[PDB]
Amino acid sequence: GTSKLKYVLQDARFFLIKSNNHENVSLAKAKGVWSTLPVNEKKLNLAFRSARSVILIFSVRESGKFQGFARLSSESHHSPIHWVLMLGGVFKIDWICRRELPFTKSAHLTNPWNEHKPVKIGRDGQEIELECGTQLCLLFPPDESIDLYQVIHKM
């Protein structure tokens, strides 16, 4: 069901994460971490202290899809992660959906914080407005392997 998901998304902040390869999103899915460049690190750190939930939505560049989304559980903090690359600290994340979603299913969603361009268009780190980000997350296929009870307890 979607109800606990809606609870987690309530008044959350959303950010578009662009990755240039699948290897890094596979590592993120496996180890519950992410790292980004400092301009985005400072944005995410400010947003983490600001909101009940800060959601990253992942897209690998040239794939035509989003690869899932996750929730910040930490601020960035400085075991070396062997990304396929000046980086910042490491955020710990909790995955809410590890399922893909093709851009063709999100064509009706525009992002007011990026000139109302379709939500798939955006620089790495681009913030997604509340309602667009919420509906984008609800578009993903339900990930039956994930239990949001643990995640709700961290709010």
The one-letter amino acid code at 94 reads D
Residue 34 known to bind ligand = yes
Alpha-carbon distance values, 63 to 37, 66, 104, 135 (Å): 22, 8, 12, 21
Torsion over CA: 50, 6, 126, 96 (sign): positive
Instruction: Count up the domains in the chain and report the number.
Output: 1
- CB within 8 Å of 13: residues ≥ 6 apart: 47, 50, 51, 53, 54, 55, 127, 130, 133
Other C-beta atoms lying within 10 Å of the C-beta of residue 122:
20
Closest to 95 measured CA to CA, from 33, 12, 9, 41: 33
Q: What is the 3-state secondary structure (H, E, C) of the chain?
A: CCHHHHHHHCCCEEEEEEECCHHHHHHHHHHCEEECCHHHHHHHHHHHHHCCCEEEEEEECCCCEECEEEEECCCCECCCCCCCCCCCCEEEEEEEECCCEEHHHHCCCEEHHHCCEECCCCCCCCEECHHHHHHHHHHCCCCCCCCHHHHHHHC
Report yes or no: 144 and 99 within 8 Å, Cβ to Cβ.
no
Annotated resolution, angstroms:
2.4
- Alpha-carbon distance 69 to 53, whole Å? 12
- Alpha-carbon distance 126 to 135, whole Å? 17
Number of Cα atoms under 13 Å in the Cβ half of residue 82: 1
Residue 124 known to bind ligand = yes
Residue 26 known to bind ligand = no
- What are 22's two structure tokens? 């699948």
Domain range spanning residue 64?
Answer: 1-155
Residue 74 known to bind ligand = no
- Alpha-carbon distance 66 to 47, whole Å? 22
What CATH number is associated with residue 118? 3.10.590.10
Q: Structure solved using which method?
A: X-ray
Residue 106 known to bind ligand = no
Residue 11 known to bind ligand = no
- φ, ψ for residue 118, nearest 5 deg: -50, 140
Residue 113 known to bind ligand = no
